[PDB]
Enzyme design. Structure first.
Site, PDB file in Angstrom:
ATOM      1  N   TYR A 508     -94.292  84.064  36.142  1.00  0.00           N
ATOM      2  CA  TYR A 508     -95.266  83.032  35.825  1.00  0.00           C
ATOM      3  C   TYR A 508     -96.564  83.708  35.383  1.00  0.00           C
ATOM      4  O   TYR A 508     -96.919  83.682  34.207  1.00  0.00           O
ATOM      5  CB  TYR A 508     -95.524  82.106  37.010  1.00  0.00           C
ATOM      6  N   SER A 591     -93.843  77.545  30.995  1.00  0.00           N
ATOM      7  CA  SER A 591     -95.269  77.259  30.767  1.00  0.00           C
ATOM      8  C   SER A 591     -95.946  78.636  30.645  1.00  0.00           C
ATOM      9  O   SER A 591     -95.580  79.410  29.763  1.00  0.00           O
ATOM     10  CB  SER A 591     -95.849  76.418  31.921  1.00  0.00           C
ATOM     11  N   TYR A 592     -96.909  78.956  31.513  1.00  0.00           N
ATOM     12  CA  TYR A 592     -97.625  80.227  31.377  1.00  0.00           C
ATOM     13  C   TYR A 592     -96.607  81.359  31.450  1.00  0.00           C
ATOM     14  O   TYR A 592     -96.755  82.391  30.794  1.00  0.00           O
ATOM     15  CB  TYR A 592     -98.708  80.403  32.452  1.00  0.00           C
ATOM     16  N   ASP A 669     -93.620  66.704  25.278  1.00  0.00           N
ATOM     17  CA  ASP A 669     -94.521  67.452  26.146  1.00  0.00           C
ATOM     18  C   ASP A 669     -95.985  67.122  25.816  1.00  0.00           C
ATOM     19  O   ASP A 669     -96.503  67.515  24.770  1.00  0.00           O
ATOM     20  CB  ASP A 669     -94.257  68.957  26.014  1.00  0.00           C
ATOM     21  N   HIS A 701     -93.086  68.159  30.008  1.00  0.00           N
ATOM     22  CA  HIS A 701     -93.269  69.538  30.422  1.00  0.00           C
ATOM     23  C   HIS A 701     -92.323  69.939  31.546  1.00  0.00           C
ATOM     24  O   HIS A 701     -91.891  71.092  31.625  1.00  0.00           O
ATOM     25  CB  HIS A 701     -94.707  69.760  30.853  1.00  0.00           C
TER      26      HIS A 701
END
Ligand SMILES: *[C@@H]1O[C@H](CO)[C@@H](O[C@@H]2O[C@H](CO)[C@@H](O[C@@H]3O[C@H](CO)[C@@H](O)[C@H](O)[C@@H]3O)[C@H](O)[C@H]2NC(C)=O)[C@H](O)[C@H]1NC(C)=O
Ligand SMILES: *[C@@H]1O[C@H](CO)[C@@H](O[C@@H]2O[C@H](CO)[C@@H](O)[C@H](O)[C@H]2NC(C)=O)[C@H](O)[C@H]1NC(C)=O
Ligand SMILES: *[C@@H]1O[C@H](CO)[C@@H](O[C@@H]2O[C@H](CO)[C@@H](O)[C@H](O)[C@H]2NC(C)=O)[C@H](O)[C@H]1NC(C)=O
Ligand SMILES: *[C@@H]1O[C@H](CO)[C@@H](O[C@@H]2O[C@H](CO)[C@@H](O)[C@H](O)[C@H]2NC(C)=O)[C@H](O)[C@H]1NC(C)=O
Ligand SMILES: *[C@@H]1O[C@H](CO)[C@@H](O)[C@H](O)[C@H]1NC(C)=O
Ligand SMILES: *[C@@H]1O[C@H](CO)[C@@H](O)[C@H](O)[C@H]1NC(C)=O
Ligand SMILES: *[C@@H]1O[C@H](CO)[C@@H](O)[C@H](O)[C@H]1NC(C)=O
Lengths: 727, 208
Positions: A508, A591-592, A669, A701
């Protein structure tokens, strides 16, 4: 024996048991057992039936949720639930009398209500409908309209717009009752000049023309929403004249430019604290405001201002921390960063600038959990110097040297990760252990820290899992430049360190993240280790949290650098360990994590064979302003445009020729827009790189709908197995 | 010759922080006449009675007047301060005064403002991090430095204004906020009457 299979993960065949309770007093709590609502007695453990489950299977609708008024007289019934964003939703509501055992039929809360909340005492209701605030003094009486400025996508009263819901308050609600329910404080958000993200929603097969969804959404550097703050007296409401709200202005240090409202905390019945934050988020102020009936205003004394700023990065972990006021409201406790860059509890006088740290060390306080006249209860990672551990401590206010660990030694083998839920006045507390063993829920009495009973020990699950070859977990650290950096590995059962295993790096790595902890999980990685004999590693490098600012603020103004390099370096050291097949190292993230995965894969380091990015950020100018600008500042030539341009995924498209890549994104998203992956693919196409892709129609998302969730993990599993030459 | 209380009922009623002042000298007045155009809610006097005010001889007769909602009656009273006396209008008690809180009657023909408005913030900002805040308050009978920002009122509730203060004015930044109170069915006003008793040959007596 068996192994933990992909089907086990997708069908949830090995369930973790929980014990969710709602405190309603200093000694009683509500709990749902076989669909009934039970009221338990903390001290004795007996229970009566508060609500028989058969009470509403003649209701005509399915109850999604319920809410009981503080005085116990009424139950708020939620049905017709329709999800919006991460926290927002609309619902229909029915109120139900609990002594007359009957459904209120008059002056009902309207359909499509955006938010509802009981006053903290008694049974007043404040709700938001069509972006305006209404107040019901009694469940059967008419409502008083507090606001008239409400307007879809433009003016939000008592609820948050998109970016405030996601990145500031983590809530749809923007309503703060005074402690005894006299005043109702509320924010007003204004999205008038905020640009709209637009994207297609295809809906059911029957829809001939796709819908275009339009959400006010400030991307990095764009025009932000504005905010005003108000307080209304709900006791002097008139059914004949329009309500009067008193505005509490932001301090003048904020009004000179762009700013946010980032914290609201009532101190007393007539004292409210507000925390404001400049758009350049290394500067914040707390204001303390007292009600003044004589002059008809909320006076925010300048001499009661508390300025919190940061010289190395931003303020707070994600935002300035909330104060915990002593009962008289003249002093408060607040988690802030010390001179060493470690976050500890600080003791403030409301009219004094300087504060006094009551804890110190090379560890951090996670959160202040409770405050009595004698003790301050907090959670920290002090025990054995493990940043991935959580324990409950109490500190004596008359003597800061008397610190007691309340959870450390309860069960040191099974339990190293704790959270806590106090009753009112903190007379009782539930402890909740999340690992490394099976979760364990206990109840304790505060007067002498006596363990009363075990609420849930997950013994059922324990019996099921002994017939299953379950993976083990190693939590340790490596060293980079005389600094400890923690990692964890999900190791396959019967782990033989003389064998070579393929390794999947689970990443992450966003600011203040922690992927190396003592938490017990039953997830995808469990299947990968248990069934496919894959080592699944995670690593908290620079930018990670709960280890002091020198680590966390390392990636300040330069996302996509050190946190990326440190994932590559960690993989190198993993491959040097001897039980890792270095010809089979993969990496994946969401995501990240998707951004870091992609950035890693495009670095040409040679360390990684293949990788999977789900809903990745690709270019920081595409992401929302509050999150992005917190770490990157503004994307202008005068500020940080250079690092904005140098840290895209598209920039590294050429290097993807050396790897197998799987790019996945939901088309609906609202958070990390499909645009971001759309640009990644286009850059790879333009440079001749072959890759695998997958879109998910109308998924957001989370990609968390039942069918989609099963589909993506099934798809990713095929990808990994194929990449690792597993049959 | 007769006192002309005309200008305080022609045009648009000024906001509280932008009050207009009529000063009468050598002039005969009918107060009963002027008061007949209004529905009076409060008549608080100081240093003089509401009877004597309509019958006395004065050297000067001063009237400050402005639009003002009666819902805020209590916030313009002595000693109880107050966004109004801090930033908008502070009554002087150096001379015998009368404060009249009234609504203008239905078929008087006033052209009222879009809304009532008062200043609820007025501060100077200095410092490297622009954060030494000094609230700026008015002396009685004087206009706020924040008045020039929008003398007609505020189109927005909680409207923000910014300005650099000249070297002369003390430098730094000037910050002002104005709040909006919705206009009422009948215009609600307030005028402050003040009298002196000068030795000089010239008087303002009532009409016979
Ligand atoms: C929500 O925010 C919007 C956008 O900032 C506000 O709209 C704006 O309000 C101003 C009032 O200050 C409008 O006025 C302009 O003021 C200047 C004089 O100082 C003058 O040049 C113009 O003739 C005009 O009066 C501005 O047009 C307006 N912009 C819009 C509507 O797009 C709005 O007031 C805010 N709403 C709330 C409830 O806070
Ligand atoms: C838990 O048990 C206590 C008793 O140990 C209950 O309190 C008693 O309730 C009975 C019957 O309602 C009364 O006649 C007694 O006067 C009560 N005594 C005391 C000391 O309270 C209590 O209501 C029970 N609570 C729950 C939730 O079951
Ligand atoms: C309370 O305020 C509302 C909103 O300002 C008033 O209703 C509006 O009155 C104006 C007057 O011209 C109309 O143009 C609007 O259409 C009305 N409705 C709305 C939703 O704005 C209402 O009259 C006020 N109530 C009282 C008792 O004064
Ligand atoms: C908040 O961070 C900004 C950005 O780093 C700081 O503003 C810069 O400060 C440096 C050195 O202090 C100057 O050389 C730059 O000219 C400033 N502007 C920019 C756009 O970088 C600001 O000083 C910080 N604020 C606080 C209170 O520490
Ligand atoms: C309601 O509670 C009873 C208590 O024994 C239980 O047997 C029954 O299954 C419950 N019904 C539902 C629909 O949960
Ligand atoms: C909600 O909608 C349903 C269906 O249109 C209607 O029967 C019901 O009366 C509505 N509820 C309220 C509170 O208006
Ligand atoms: C709640 O607090 C307010 C403000 O101090 C006070 O005026 C009121 O009486 C209180 N109400 C109750 C029920 O305690």
């Amino acid at each position: 024996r068996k192994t933990y299979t992909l089907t086990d993960y997708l069908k949830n065949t090995y369930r973790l048991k929980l014990y969710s309770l709602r405190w309603i007093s200093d000694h009683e709590y509500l709990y749902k057992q076989e669909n009934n609502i039970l009221v338990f007695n903390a001290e004795y453990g007996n229970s009566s039936v508060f609500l028989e489950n058969s009470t509403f299977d003649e209701f005509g609708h399915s109850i999604n949720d319920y809410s009981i008024s503080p005085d116990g007289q009424f139950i708020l019934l939620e049905y017709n639930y329709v999800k919006q964003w991460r926290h927002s939703y609309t619902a229909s509501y029915d109120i139900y009398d609990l002594n007359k055992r009957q459904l209120i039929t008059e002056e009902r809360i309207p359909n499509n209500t955006q938010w509802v909340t009981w006053s903290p005492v008694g049974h007043k209701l404040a709700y938001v409908w069509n972006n305006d605030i209404y107040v019901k003094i009694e469940p059967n009486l008419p409502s008083y309209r507090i606001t008239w400025t409400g307007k879809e996508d433009i003016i939000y009263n008592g609820i948050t717009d998109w970016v405030y819901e996601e990145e500031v308050f983590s809530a749809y609600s923007a309503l703060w009752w005074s402690p005894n329910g006299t005043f109702l404080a509320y924010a007003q958000f204004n999205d008038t000049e905020v640009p709209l993200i637009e994207y297609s929603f295809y809906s059911d097969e029957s829809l001939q023309y796709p819908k275009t969804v339009r959400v006010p959404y400030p991307k990095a550097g764009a025009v932000n929403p504005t905010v005003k703050f108000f307080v209304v007296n709900t006791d002097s409401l008139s059914s004949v004249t329009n309500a009067t709200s008193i505005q509490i202005t932001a301090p003048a240090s904020m009004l000179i430019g762009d700013h946010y409202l980032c914290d609201v905390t009532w101190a007393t019945q007539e004292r409210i604290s507000l925390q404001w934050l400049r758009r350049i988020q290394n500067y914040s102020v707390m204001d303390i405001c007292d009600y003044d009936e004589s002059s008809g205003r909320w006076n925010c004394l300048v001499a009661r201002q508390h300025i919190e700023m940061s010289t190395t990065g931003w303020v707070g972990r994600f935002r300035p921390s909330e104060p915990h006021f002593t009962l008289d409201g003249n002093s408060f406790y607040k988690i802030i960063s010390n001179e060493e860059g470690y976050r500890h509890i600080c003791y403030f006088q409301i009219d004094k600038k300087d504060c006094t740290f009551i804890t110190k060390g090379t560890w951090e306080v996670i959160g202040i959990e409770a405050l009595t006249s004698d003790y301050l209860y907090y959670i920290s990672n002090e025990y054995k110097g493990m940043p991935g551990g959580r324990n409950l401590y109490k500190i004596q206010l008359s003597d800061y040297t008397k610190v007691t660990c309340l959870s450390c030694e309860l069960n040191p083998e099974r339990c190293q990760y704790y959270s806590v839920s106090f009753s009112k006045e903190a007379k009782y507390y539930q402890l909740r252990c999340s690992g490394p063993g099976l979760p364990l829920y206990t109840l304790h009495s505060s007067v002498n820290d006596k363990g009363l009973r075990v609420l849930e020990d997950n013994s059922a699950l324990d019996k099921m899992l002994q017939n299953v070859q379950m993976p083990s977990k190693k939590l340790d650290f490596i060293i980079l430049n005389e600094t400890k950096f923690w990692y964890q590995m999900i190791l396959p059962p019967h782990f033989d360190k003389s064998k070579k295993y393929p390794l999947l790096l689970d990443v992450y790595a966003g600011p203040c993240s922690q992927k190396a902890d003592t938490v017990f999980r039953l997830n995808w990685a469990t299947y990968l280790a248990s069934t496919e004999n894959i080592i699944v590693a995670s690593f908290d490098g620079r930018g990670s949290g709960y280890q002091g600012d020198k680590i966390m603020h390392a990636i300040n103004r330069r996302l996509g650098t050190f946190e990326v390099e440190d994932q590559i370096e960690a993989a190198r050291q993993f491959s040097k360990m001897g039980f890792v097949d270095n010809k089979r190292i993969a990496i994946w993230g969401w995501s990240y994590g998707g951004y870091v995965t992609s950035m890693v894969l495009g670095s040409g380091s040679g360390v990684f064979k293949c990788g999977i990015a789900v809903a990745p950020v690709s270019r920081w100018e595409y992401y929302d302003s509050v999150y992005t600008e917190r770490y990157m500042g503004l994307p202008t030539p005068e500020d940080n445009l250079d690092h904005y341009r140098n840290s895209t995924v598209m920039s590294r498209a050429e290097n993807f020729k050396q790897v197998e890549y799987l790019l996945i994104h939901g088309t609906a998203d609202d958070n990390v827009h499909f645009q971001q992956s759309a640009q990644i693919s286009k850059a790879l196409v333009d440079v001749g790189v072959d890759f695998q892709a997958m879109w998910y129609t109308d998924e957001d998302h989370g990609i968390a709908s039942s069918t989609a969730h099963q589909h993506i993990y099934t798809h990713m599993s095929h990808f990994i197995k194929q990449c690792f030459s597993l049959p | 010759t007769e006192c002309d209380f005309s200008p305080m009922l022609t045009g648009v009623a000024p906001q509280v922080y932008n009050f207009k002042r009529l000063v009468f000298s050598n002039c005969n007045y009918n107060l009963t006449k002027l008061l007949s155009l209004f529905a009076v809610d409060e008549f608080s006097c100081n240093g003089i009675s509401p009877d004597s005010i309509a019958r006395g001889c004065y050297s000067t007769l001063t009237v400050d007047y402005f639009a003002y909602p009666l819902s805020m009656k209590s916030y313009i009273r002595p000693g109880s301060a107050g966004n109004i006396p801090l930033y908008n209008y502070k009554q002087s008690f150096a001379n015998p005064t009368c404060r009249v809180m009234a609504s203008v009657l239905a078929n008087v023909t006033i052209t009222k403002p879009h809304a009532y408005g008062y200043i609820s913030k007025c501060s100077r900002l200095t410092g490297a991090n622009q954060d030494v805040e000094t609230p700026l308050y008015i002396n009685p009978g004087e206009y706020s430095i924040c008045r020039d920002f929008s003398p007609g009122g505020f189109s927005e509730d909680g409207q923000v204004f910014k300005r650099t203060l000249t070297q002369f004015e003390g430098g730094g930044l000037l910050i002002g906020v104005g709040t909006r109170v919705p206009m009422t069915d009948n215009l609600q006003m307030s005028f402050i009457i003040s009298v002196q008793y000068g030795t000089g040959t010239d008087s303002v007596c009532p009409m016979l």
